[PDB]
Amino acid sequence: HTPEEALALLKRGAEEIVPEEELLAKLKEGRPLTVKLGADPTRPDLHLGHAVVLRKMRQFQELGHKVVLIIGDFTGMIGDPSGRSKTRPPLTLEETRENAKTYVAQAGKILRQEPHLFELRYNSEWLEGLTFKEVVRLTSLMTVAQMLEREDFKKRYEAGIPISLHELLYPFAQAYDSVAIRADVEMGGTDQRFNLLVGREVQRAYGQSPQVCFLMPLLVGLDGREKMSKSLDNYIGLTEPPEAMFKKLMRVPDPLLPSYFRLLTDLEEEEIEALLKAGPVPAHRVLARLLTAAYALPQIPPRIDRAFYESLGYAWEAFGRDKEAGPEEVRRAEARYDEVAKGGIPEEIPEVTIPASELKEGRIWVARLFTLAGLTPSNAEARRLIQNRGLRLDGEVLTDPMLQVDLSRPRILQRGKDRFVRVRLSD
Amino acid sequence: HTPEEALALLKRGAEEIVPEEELLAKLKEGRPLTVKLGADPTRPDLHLGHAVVLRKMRQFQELGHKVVLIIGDFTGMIGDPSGRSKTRPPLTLEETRENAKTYVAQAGKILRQEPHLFELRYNSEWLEGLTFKEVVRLTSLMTVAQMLEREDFKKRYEAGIPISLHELLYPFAQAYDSVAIRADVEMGGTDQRFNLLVGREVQRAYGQSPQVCFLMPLLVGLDGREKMSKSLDNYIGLTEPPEAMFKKLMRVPDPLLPSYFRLLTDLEEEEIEALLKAGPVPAHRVLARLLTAAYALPQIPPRIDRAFYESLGYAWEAFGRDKEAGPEEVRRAEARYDEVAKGGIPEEIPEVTIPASELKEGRIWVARLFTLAGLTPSNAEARRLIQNRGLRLDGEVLTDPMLQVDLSRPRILQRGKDRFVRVRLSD
RNA sequence: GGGCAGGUUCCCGAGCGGCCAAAGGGGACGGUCUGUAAAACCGUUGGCGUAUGCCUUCGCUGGUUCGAAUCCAGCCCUGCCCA
RNA sequence: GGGCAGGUUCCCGAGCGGCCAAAGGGGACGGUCUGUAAAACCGUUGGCGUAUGCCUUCGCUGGUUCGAAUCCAGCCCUGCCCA
Ligand SMILES: Nc1ncnc2c1ncn2[C@@H]1O[C@H](COP(=O)(O)OP(=O)(O)OP(=O)(O)O)[C@@H](O)[C@H]1O
Ligand SMILES: Nc1ncnc2c1ncn2[C@@H]1O[C@H](COP(=O)(O)OP(=O)(O)OP(=O)(O)O)[C@@H](O)[C@H]1O
Ligand SMILES: N[C@H](CO)Cc1ccc(O)cc1
Ligand SMILES: N[C@H](CO)Cc1ccc(O)cc1
């Protein structure tokens, strides 16, 4: 694909690219551009949200450009204020580096690892030794009125909500990473406009070609309103078992399916529109199958498309009705979903042995058992859950909080619609 | 003097000491307290303004405490925003270190140098290696709303006047210097409240006894309104020749004499009040004599008082009329003042030889001569000055801008009331 | 990144095509009155041996016209409103 | 540094001396209806082998009273107004 042609593929599904005429230009230079993308391991594991920007990076690699993944072990220590309406809490450099592990491992599910298209870097490499005098020069490149001109900060300032002064350095620390690696393009979610812009500003200061800001739409999380985030618990991990990933995707609030196909799949608007035709449930089945299938593999395919869907063994014309077809892992997944919907037990449930000592008088109080089992944070809670008709013992809905369970033979504990644990005597 | 007693001597003439009960306490610890006082050599030479805080430091040394003079060669690079209503301009670390020279030399005119009472330090020693991570911790000790709560910043922000973000680090850089040397007390002009307070804040963060902020009144400069400053050209240098120092003090606007005696001398309110009795001119004579006398010496006396005034040979009862009395240097000084008032020539005038080549046709144009002499920035100016009846040749008020001066024998050039230069042929 | 308002001489600031080295105010400098003060008042506030001559100064770099501080073009910087 | 208003449970937030493990709203969790969705509705929202018993939780540390989340004292932190 020639320049003019690449700028298209890339431009598709993208929120905004500014300044676009510069990306079109850089493409014409016939040399691997440097595509930057950082992530602050404040919490482990990546998720479908990240997949939004990562699949895009992948696509840049696919057109021969090099991607540099910046693991913000340092920045993550400071905490990125973008969005947050409250100072993010502190994090030690040892912590962020612990999380980083997951990020490296996991990025691979979407990114290419071939050395000429992928470099890994932790900004703590070049940021710890940034000198006080050097900082002063960065922070002198912008004015107070400009910082406060940010959505996030404005609101907070006006609302009289504390803003730690250090929260103002973050933009610059991120900005530097750009200079650090002469980035041609910095990838990002829309909530990174500001940071990506300060990146251009700081690059000029260091006499470098101002990177091309590439913003991707933000994927909304399972709650329906807020964006997917590791801190909001509304995400679908990139490395959850197919069972889990499949069920969660079956829960993506209806009003979002359109967005999910656009940001997570490669289906033509037409194919999407016709899917919603079949209705909500059917679409979910499809969306779920694709992604559970895709992320099941060691690395997703260059394109999650109608063909890829069919290559699995499904009939696009079947619109999800063809449950039987499909991989012997996505199958069982969708299968577990349905059994549970019906109110049946999942085939494979986690067993958890219970030391005879934990017994008392030969039995064990249901309240405590559910806790010893990790289904309830505590007896009191269990009790409460039971009064609320929320736990089941061997399929039967418990009703006697004082119940004394007999662990002679295994038992199948249950909490809510889909949390199962088989337990037995081991001691 | 016991603690309770010291807290008094010190408290006299001082703007405010906060928190006072802490200084009273520290005094009782019977151990040399650490009195901090920094200065940013943005421009060379100290002046009577500085003398305000320096004489106070001296007094702390006089009661046995140790003074640590911090030469802000680093801070001076950043630029202290206090007061300034516009970002101070940049300064290289090599520059500030050039100026520093003057400051060390000159501080001595007021400060004691005995090692157990005086230490010299350039904060660039401990500030250059302050790490980015370390900075983040300093700037996290305060909120935006608090920075903007400053007189200086508020005004500017509201007034829509640019505030470089780096201007916000200065407080912290100064604050650190406190931690750096476990300062018990930081001295300062009232325009340093904020900085001195952030110093306590930052000390707590580093688990140190929050220093005692000691604010001294600001001495107003010769203009009459604005405070004396190296950047406003309204100062009287601590190391100007007695001639100069004497004449400038004879120009201290009347409405300020009270302040000048209080901040620069050690005369009881009573003595001051009775001086103003004699009237303006007489008081000036006295004020001038004292300080010109005092700063004439290699180091001022512990107290510029009525006794010291008399020890010079003056009659306090004479109220300045006794012009003859006095040192053979302060005498000639006051003498030059008067001759010039009368319109006479000063005895000792600076000569400046003029290379025959500079001649043209045997003469030299008055306009150019005044420039070759350093009395006028340029011919045009000279011409203009002359049209304005502002230059004199040999006592005669020039009137012919095209005049061709004859440098056969010396000539006495003059610009305004008191700028004289004798010039002659040398080549 | 996008919209609008700004960028001019020491500072702030007016600026129209040629009347622009460029209004006014401030500051500062000279001067008068004085006390080598203040106030008031009167001037000055790009440079060149002395000048229908040239250069420097209107954010930068180009261009239009005979002629650009004004106009056009790209870029830089600030405030506000955005994102 | 000084004045005033705040600091309470996952969040925001009411709080009076004992009625406080502490109102209400949000979120979240259970449940009903469903499509393992939404909306609506009904509950839950410190812990302890099962409890006129104790502990943890009202910014920190002390103290008053029989009894403190409420009161007093010093200190910490935030917003506004100051300096
Ligand atoms: N839900 C999302 N949808 C789309 N892109 C996302 C989403 N979350 C994060 N990203 C992108 O991934 C990049 C890395 O995110 P990172 O984890 O560093 O911070 P974050 O925004 O706090 O993440 P989280 O959303 O997990 O809080 C972001 O710069 C953004 O471009
Ligand atoms: N006119 C003055 N009157 C009284 N104290 C002064 C005066 N000028 C400066 N000081 C004091 O001297 C200290 C050192 O001043 P420094 O030269 O570092 O900064 P500055 O305030 O810019 O000085 P300047 O007044 O020369 O601009 C200040 O912290 C202040 O305490
Ligand atoms: N700050 C972004 C969100 O956490 C991630 C990041 C982006 C760019 C970097 O150079 C570093 C981190
Ligand atoms: N910032 C003050 C005025 O210039 C001077 C100063 C005061 C304290 C220091 O630690 C350093 C400099």
CATH number of residue A354's parent domain: 3.10.290.10
Give the separation between CA B144 and CA B98, rounded to whole angstroms: 35
Q: Residue B319 and residue B332: Cα distance in Å, rounded?
A: 19
Task: Determine whether the annotation assigns residue B230 to a binding site.
Answer: yes
Residue pair B67/B61 in contact (Cβ under 8 Å)? The answer is yes
Element (H, E) at A56: helix A48-61
Q: Which helix (H) or strand (E) holds B36?
A: strand B34-39
Q: Flag whether residue B78 sits within 8 Å of chain A, measured between CB atoms.
A: yes
- Pairwise CB contact (< 8 Å): A133 & B168: no
Residue B164: closest C-alpha in chain A: A143
Q: Report DSSP state, residue B347.
A: S
- The token duo for A393 is 């013992």
Say if residue A103 is exposed, middle or buried (CB neighbours under 10 Å; 0-12, 13-18, 19+): buried
How many A/B residue pairs have CB atoms within 8 Å? 104
Structural domain includes residue A425: no
Helices (H), B160-222: 170-180, 193-205
**Cα–Cα dist B173/B154, whole Å:** 21
Nearest in space to B7 (alpha carbons), one of B20, B15, B16, B264 = B20
Same domain (yes/no): A165, A289: no
Q: Which residues pair with A220 in a beta bridge?
A: A227
Question: Do residues A350 and A267 both lie within one domain?
Answer: no
CA of residue A135 relative to chain centroid, distance: 32
Q: Which nucleotide is nearest to B340 (CA to C1')?
A: C36
Contact (CB, 8 A) for A336 and A243: yes
Q: Which DSSP state fits B360?
A: B
- Looking at residue A168, the DSSP 8-state letter turns out to be G
Q: Both tokens of residue B275?
A: 């001086």
Which helix (H) or strand (E) is A380 found in, with range?
Answer: helix A379-387
CATH of the domain at A10: 3.40.50.620
Q: Which nucleotide is nearest to A143 (CA to C1')?
A: C78
Q: How far is CA A21 from the centre of its chain?
A: 31
How far is residue A214 CA from its own chain's centroid?
A: 19
**Ramachandran quadrant class, B136 (left: phi over 0; alpha: psi -120 to 50; beta: rest):** alpha
Question: Which two three-digit tokens encode residue B236?
Answer: 């009287």
List the alpha helices (DSSP H) in B85-131: 93-107, 124-127
Name residues 208-267 of chain A with a Cβ under 7 Å from nucleic strand D.
223-224, 234, 247, 250-251, 253-254
| Contact between residue A362 and residue A397 where contact means Cβ atoms under 8 Å apart | no
Give residue A344's identity as a one-letter amino acid code: G
CATH of the domain at B259: 1.10.240.10
Ligand 4 pocket list (CB less than 6 A)? B 38-40, 70, 72, 75, 80, 123, 174, 177, 192, 195
- Which positions ≥6 away from A415 have C-beta within 8 Å? A370, A375, A376, A385, A390, A391
The residue segments making up the domain with residue B264 are: 219-335
Structural domain contains residue A426 = no
Q: Based on the domain organization, do B91 and B183 belong to the same domain? A: yes
Contacts of A176 in chain B (CB under 8 A): none
- 8 Å CB contact between A215 and A20: no
Q: How far apart are CA A102 and CA A50, in angstroms?
A: 13
Examine residue A143 and state whether it is found in any structural domain, yes or no: yes
For atom 7 of ligand 1, the residue with the nearest CA is A49
> How far A357 CA lies from chain B's nearest CA (Å)?
50
Assigned token pair, A243: 């069972």
Q: How far is CA B141 from the centre of its chain?
A: 33
Angle at A345 between CA A339 and CA A348, to 5 degrees: 100
Do A170 and A181 lie in one domain? The reply is yes
Whether residue B427 is contained in a domain is answered as no
Q: Which of B141, B184, B189 is nearest to B30 (CA)?
A: B184
The distance of B147 to chain A (nearest Cα, Å) reads 8
Cα A153-A156-A160 angle, rounded to 5 deg: 135
Q: How many CB atoms lie under 10 A from the CB of residue A390?
A: 18
Range list of H helices, B295-345: 306-311, 330-342
- Nearest residue (by CA) to ligand 1, atom 18, is A39
Residues 6 or more apart whose CB falls under 8 angstroms from that of B29 comprise: none
Total domains in chain A come to 3
**Which chain B residue's Cα is nearest to A92?**
B133
Gap sites in chain B (C to N > 2.5 Å), preceding residue numbers = none
* Contact positions of strand D to protein Cβ (< 7 A): 1-2, 27-31, 34-39, 43-51, 76-83
Residue B242 CB closer than 7 angstroms to strand C?
A: no
Cα distances from B318 to residues B285, B333, B361, in angstroms, run: 11, 19, 57
Residue A233: which residues within 8 A CB-CB, separation 6 or more? none
Task: Please tell me what resolution, in angstroms, this structure has.
Answer: 2.9
Same domain, A206 and A352: no
Q: Which helix (H) or strand (E) holds A185?
A: strand A185-189
Name every chain A residue with its beta carbon within 8 A of the beta carbon of B168: 139, 144, 165, 168
Using an 8 Å Cβ cutoff, are B164 and A179 in contact?
A: no
Per-residue DSSP letter, B354: E
Does some domain include residue B421? no
Q: How far apart are CA A249 and CA A257, in angstroms?
A: 9
A364: region left, alpha or beta (phi > 0 left; psi from -120 to 50 alpha)? beta
Give B330: exposed, middle or buried? Use CB within 10 Å, 0-12, 13-18, 19+: buried
DSSP 3-state of B425 = strand
Cα separation, A15 vs A44, whole angstroms: 26
Neighbours of B267 (CB within 10 A): 23
Closest chain A C-alpha to B73 CA, distance in angstroms: 12
Residue that the structure tokens 């963060």 belong to: B205
CA B121 to each of CA A133, A150, A369, A399, B60: distance values in angstroms, whole numbers, following the listed order: 18, 41, 68, 77, 18
Last residue of a domain, one of A218, A242, A268: A218
CA distance B214 to B217: 10
- Verify whether the Cβ–Cβ distance A165 to B144 is below 8 Å: yes
* Residue B214: CB less than 7 A from any atom in strand D: no
Residue A18 shares a structural domain with residue A164: yes
Same domain, B201 and B226: no
H/E run at residue A105:
helix A93-107
Q: Which residues 142-171 of chain A have a CB within 8 Å of chain B?
A: 142-145, 147-148, 153, 157, 160, 162-169
Strand D lies under 7 A from the Cβ of residue A419: yes
**CA distances for B374 relative to A10, B317, B324, B427, angstroms:** 68, 43, 33, 19
Asked whether residue B424 is assigned to any structural domain, the reply reads no
**Contact between B248 and B254 (Cβ < 8 Å):** no
State how far the Cα of A393 lies from the Cα of A399, in Å rounded to an integer.
10
**Closest Cα in chain B, distance from residue A358 (Å):** 48
In a domain, residue B106? The reply is yes
Other CB atoms within 10 Å distance of the CB of residue A141? 19
- Per the DSSP assignment, residues forming a β-bridge with B36 are B68, B186
Extended strands (E) in A297-419: 351-354, 364-365, 391-393, 396-397, 404-405, 411-415
Same domain membership, residue A256 and residue A146 = no
A150 with A22, same domain? yes
Instruction: Indicate if A45 and A171 belong to the same structural domain.
Output: yes
Q: Which of A335, A361, A383 is the last residue in one of the domains?
A: A335
Per residue in B225-234, is it b (16+ CB within 10 Å) or e — as a string?
eebbbbeeeb
C-alpha to C-alpha distance for B204 and A409, rounded to whole angstroms: 62
Q: Which of B331, B306, B426 is nearest to B373 (CA)?
A: B426
Contact criterion met (CB below 8 Å) for B110 and B201: no
Cβ neighbours around A277 below 10 Å, total:
10
State which of A335, A369, A402 marks the end of a domain.
Answer: A335
Cα–Cα distance measured from residue A11 to residue B2, given in angstroms and rounded to the nearest whole number: 80
Q: Are residues B64 and B132 in the same domain?
A: yes
Which amino acid would we find at residue B334? Answer: E
Helix B280-294 × helix B269-278 angle, to 10°: 130
Residues 6+ apart with CB under 8 A from A104: A71, A120
In a domain, B426, yes or no: no
Shared domain check, A177 and A48:
yes
Q: What does DSSP say about strands B212-216 and A411-415: parallel, antiparallel, or unpaired?
A: unpaired
- What region, left, alpha or beta, does residue A374 occupy, with left being phi > 0 and alpha being psi -120 to 50 degrees? left
Q: Is the dihedral of CA B315, B320, B323, B326 positive or negative?
A: positive
Largest CA distance in chain A: 79
User: What b/e sequence results for A70-91 when a residue is b if at least 16 CB atoms lie within 10 Å of its CB, and e otherwise?
Assistant: bbbbbbbbbbbbbeeeebbeeb
B209 near B184, Cβ under 8 Å? Answer: yes
Burial class (CB in 10 A: 0-12, 13-18, 19+), A195: buried
Q: Are B63 and B27 spatial neighbours (Cβ–Cβ below 8 Å)?
A: no
Please enumerate in sequence order all residues whose Cβ is within 8 A of that of A80, keeping only pairs 6 or more positions apart, or say none.
A40, A72, A88, A170, A174, A195
**Cβ–Cβ contacts within 10 Å for residue B384, how many?**
14
Residue among A93, A132, A173 whose CB faces B127 most closely: A132
Dihedral angle of Cα B23, B28, B29, B32, to the nearest 10 degrees: 70
Residue B229 identity: S
Cβ B210 to strand D below 7 Å: yes
